[PDB]
Amino acid sequence: AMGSFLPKGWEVRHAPNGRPFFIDHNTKTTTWEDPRL
């Protein structure tokens, strides 16, 4: 049930070990959980 696009207002970043994380600019949340999953 994977999404085809990142939701509006979100950005991907990568931590030093190469693990992605996700920022939600409009709720000011930073999470390891991919919102498309």
User: CA-CA distances (angstroms) from residue 30 to 6, 7, 8, 19?
Assistant: 14, 14, 15, 13
Experimental method: X-ray
The tokens describing 3, both together, are: 């999404």
Find the radius of gyration of the CA atoms of the chain. Answer: 10
3-state secondary structure of 30: strand
With beta carbons less than 8 A apart as the criterion, state whether 35 and 3 touch.
yes
Is the distance from CB of 21 to CB of 27 less than 8 angstroms? no
Query: Which tokens in the block code for residue 26?
Result: 């409009």
> CA–CA separation, 18 vs 9, rounded Å?
22
In whole angstroms, give the CA distance from residue 21 to residue 34: 7
Q: What is the DSSP string of 3-23?
A: -SSPPTTEEEEE-TTS-EEEE
